[PDB]
Design a protein around this ligand. Structure first.
Ligand SMILES: [Mg+2]
Ligand SMILES: [Mg+2]
Ligand SMILES: [Mg+2]
Ligand SMILES: [Mg+2]
Ligand SMILES: [Mg+2]
Ligand SMILES: [Mg+2]
Ligand SMILES: [Mg+2]
Ligand SMILES: [Mg+2]
Ligand SMILES: [Mg+2]
Ligand SMILES: [Mg+2]
Ligand SMILES: [Mg+2]
Ligand SMILES: [Mg+2]
Ligand SMILES: [Mg+2]
Ligand SMILES: [Mg+2]
Ligand SMILES: [Mg+2]
Ligand SMILES: [Mg+2]
Ligand SMILES: [Mg+2]
Ligand SMILES: [Mg+2]
Ligand SMILES: [Mg+2]
Ligand SMILES: [Mg+2]
Ligand SMILES: [Mg+2]
Lengths: 179, 141, 68, 148
RNA sequence: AUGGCAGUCACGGGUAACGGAGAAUUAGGGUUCGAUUCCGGAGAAGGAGCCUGAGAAACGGCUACUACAACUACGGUUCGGCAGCAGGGAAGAAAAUUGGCCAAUCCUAAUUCAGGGAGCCAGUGACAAGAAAUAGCAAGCUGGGAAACUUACGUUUCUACGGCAUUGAAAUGAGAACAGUGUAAAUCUCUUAGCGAGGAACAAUUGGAGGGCAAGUCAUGGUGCCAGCAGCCGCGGUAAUUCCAGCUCCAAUAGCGUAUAUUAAAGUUGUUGCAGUUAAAAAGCUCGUAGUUGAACUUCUGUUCAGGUUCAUUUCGAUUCGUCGUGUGAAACU
């Protein structure tokens, strides 16, 4: 008797033109710039940027004093702020649109750990936030595709991880036989 | 004005007109006339069958070649089927009377440009994907 | 015919495959290598109109060394 | 060692107990054993350990913090009447949980096909564990226990 | 008594049609589905009849018939109906264990303790959805470079960098595990000690490389309109860019081909938004009830007051990282 009720949702987005010379070129130049793994990821991001603009357009369709806009518009922006996509001095909705996927990509646990000199590379970082080598907030973050919020961008180290805690993984297996 | 009538009171007219002038579409006319159900598979995507005999067919126009084909007998349907056996050595696996799984070739209707009156592909022998029998390291009986 | 089945394949001399010298990294690594061999700034550097074909290296040992 | 912070507490005079959320801090050691958590709590409350029952725990994805809920009963004599039969076998007070299903389903089989005469007899053979039995055992823990 | 319905489609027929809530794609308008967790309906092998009850034509109740299932000492009998669960058979392109429990959600009863294949647990499970590893760092050699040192191919250095069957130790889940958590119990996850990675390794496939459609200008081997490819163009008849295969490349990547129905591309069914001389398409021509479509007039207008609104500003008071108040003019609202 199976009656699930949790919800679906695809984070993907397949492109119409399957072999756009110019499009693929950006996806790769992107995957290499952000240490991505598969084209999927790149679409996952575009799909997200979508929900924002589709909601920006949806709101721009309103009177400037619409009970709805006034409330949802602000709240959407407030969120662009917590994730730091727009700077204090970029309120107005119209700005929600001029958002580079390149900008939204930069606010990831990946893009951050590297740009925080906390790693030797855009890649080095990638295996790190993987091996738990990175804690955020009061919790530990394993998933490289974290949406790093402004407020907590301070709290990002390695709590009780070999590079702060007490290592002995490859070390132990190493020194014991040396004798 | 043009042919179509532009009255706010004449919706009915436009409506019936579209429902009518719409039969001119084959795609429409097709599914609308339970045509899909009358084909050999009875709408189905695939069909099991027994090999009635391996026959060969000649290529058409600018091509000249011996195509490999199996005459199959579909199970519940019970029809004579013309089925093209894919890749190279393929027919060398199809033993007469074995069980075969067939599917169509690009939209049920025109066969591949080359073939004559064949509308089907053979994908399984004794319930063993052909591709599998085509690559050594896979399967064989 | 019939007995003429697969005449081709039967007649083909089975050549063997070059047993992997090392390995082919599968994962972000492969996509990485590609990024490097082609969209890395040194190739986007020289004219975008005079940059080579991602397979002119048809495996030609003579032009393989001339490039590297 | 550990550090516990009590979080959300209610006072239920009905079942005579206080319900509270627990947040164990074990930065270093692995998840705390209910047992050990039982006493570091009883100490902060200053209540007999066996009158404090802790259930349900978690452990945030590697971080040394575990959330859980516990219960404070005033009279172990209340605690014994309220707690579930399964929580008792857990403190090794009630005991076993033998496989009823199968046989009960089979007796239904026979009984449904007999007249009172034998039925009674059959019934004198259905896998034990009466509620009347559960009580006598509950009762024994009652008298035989006293302290704190 | 003789009406009731009908082209504003009766009556009849089809529906691989149970209706909704909704589902898939969507510039807008649309197109196609809704067996299937909610609701309502219908039914329990087909069909009719009934007992009982507050309540069903019930159907995990009964009676007869049609077709069936089980036992028989063949006299007779069945608390015989799985479109409840678990399973077989059958059909077929096609769908899991004859498991566990009453612990949670609720239900039922004389009812705080009893029963419940509702339901929950677990097994099977790439339907499908979420996150995500198959490597990271550095030395050295080296290509690049590059900034330099500077009339030439030479040294310093550094760098977006980039290569290697050369180097080196750190890192780490898979894995496998005493403990703890969790559980009705059990499995698993999660926390975590002892153990756990260097090349056929602890692992990427699938599908292509003439055009559309991203990627071989290999002077590669075999085949010779044969075998075969090919979605459509077309490949193939001894020097094949499409076959067989090697090599190297490309694409999506724990996924990727294929078949079929269906959405968009389809302004290729068009209300928005088509076409109609010659490409398909104005009827040979007129009349004409249904239908569709219909000319212009009826307090206009002015004055003044007021509330905001805006906008303008040879301008005023406030605040800052962008608003308010004040005045005019103006319009229009009211
Ligand atoms: Mg660790
Ligand atoms: Mg042709
Ligand atoms: Mg019981
Ligand atoms: Mg009808
Ligand atoms: Mg329907
Ligand atoms: Mg229902
Ligand atoms: Mg009703
Ligand atoms: Mg069943
Ligand atoms: Mg229960
Ligand atoms: Mg019960
Ligand atoms: Mg009574
Ligand atoms: Mg399950
Ligand atoms: Mg998945
Ligand atoms: Mg255990
Ligand atoms: Mg090495
Ligand atoms: Mg391949
Ligand atoms: Mg091929
Ligand atoms: Mg080839
Ligand atoms: Mg050749
Ligand atoms: Mg495709
Ligand atoms: Mg058409």
């Amino acid at each position: 008797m199976g009656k699930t009720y949790i919800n679906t949702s695809k984070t993907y987005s397949t492109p119409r033109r399957p072999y756009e010379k110019e499009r693929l070129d950006n996806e790769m130049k992107l995957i290499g710039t952000f240490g991505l793994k598969n084209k999927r990821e790149v679409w996952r991001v575009q799909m997200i940027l979508a929900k924002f603009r589709k909601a920006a357009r949806e709101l721009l369709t309103l009177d400037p004093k619409d009970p709805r806009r006034l409330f949802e518009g602000s709240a959407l922006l407030r969120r662009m702020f917590k994730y730091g996509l727009l700077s204090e001095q970029e309120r107005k909705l119209d700005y929600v649109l001029g958002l580079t996927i390149h900008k939204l990509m930069e606010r990831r646990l990946q893009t951050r750990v590297f740009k925080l000199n906390l790693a030797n590379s855009i890649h080095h970082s990638r295996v790190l936030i993987r091996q738990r080598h990175i804690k955020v907030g009061k919790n530990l973050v394993n998933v490289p595709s974290f949406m790093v919020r402004t407020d907590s961008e301070k709290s990002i180290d390695f709590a009780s991880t070999s590079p702060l805690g007490g290592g002995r993984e490859g070390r132990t297996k190493r020194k014991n036989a040396k004798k | 004005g043009v042919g179509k009538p532009r009255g706010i009171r004449a919706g009915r007219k436009l409506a019936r007109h579209r429902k009518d002038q719409r039969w001119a579409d084959n795609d429409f006319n097709k599914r609308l006339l339970g045509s899909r159900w009358r084909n050999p598979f009875m709408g189905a995507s695939h069909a099991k069958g027994l090999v009635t005999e391996k026959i060969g067919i000649e290529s058409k126009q600018p091509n000249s070649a011996v195509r490999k084909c199996v005459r199959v007998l579909l199970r519940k349907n019970s029809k004579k089927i013309a089925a093209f056996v894919p890749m190279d050595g393929c027919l060398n696996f199809l033993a007469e009377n074995d069980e075969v799984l067939v599917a169509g070739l690009g939209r049920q209707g025109h066969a591949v440009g080359d073939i004559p009156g064949v509308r089907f592909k053979v994908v399984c022998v004794k319930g063993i994907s052909l591709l599998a029998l085509f690559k050594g390291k896979k399967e064989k009986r | 015919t019939l007995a003429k089945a697969g005449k081709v394949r039967k007649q083909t001399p089975k050549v063997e495959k070059k047993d992997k010298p090392r390995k082919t990294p599968k994962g972000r690594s492969y996509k990485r290598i590609l990024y490097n061999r082609r969209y890395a700034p040194h190739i986007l550097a020289t004219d975008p109109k005079k940059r080579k074909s991602p397979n002119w290296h048809a495996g030609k040992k003579e032009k393989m060394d001339a490039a590297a | 060692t550990i550090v516990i912070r009590t979080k959300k507490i209610l006072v239920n005079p009905l079942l005579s107990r206080r319900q509270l959320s627990l947040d164990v801090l074990h930065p270093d050691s692995p998840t705390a054993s209910k047992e050990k958590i039982r006493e570091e709590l009883a100490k902060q409350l200053k209540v007999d350990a066996r009158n404090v029952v802790v259930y349900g725990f978690s452990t945030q994805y590697g971080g040394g913090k575990s959330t859980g809920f516990a219960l404070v009963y005033d009279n172990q004599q209340y605690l014994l009447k309220y707690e579930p039969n399964y929580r008792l076998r857990k403190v090794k007070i009630l005991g076993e949980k033998p496989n009823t299903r199968r046989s009960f389903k089979e007796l239904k089989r026979k009984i449904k096909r007999t007249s009172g005469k034998a039925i009674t007899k059959l019934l004198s053979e259905k896998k034990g564990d009466t509620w009347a039995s559960v009580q006598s055992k509950k009762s024994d823990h009652l008298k035989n226990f006293v302290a704190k």
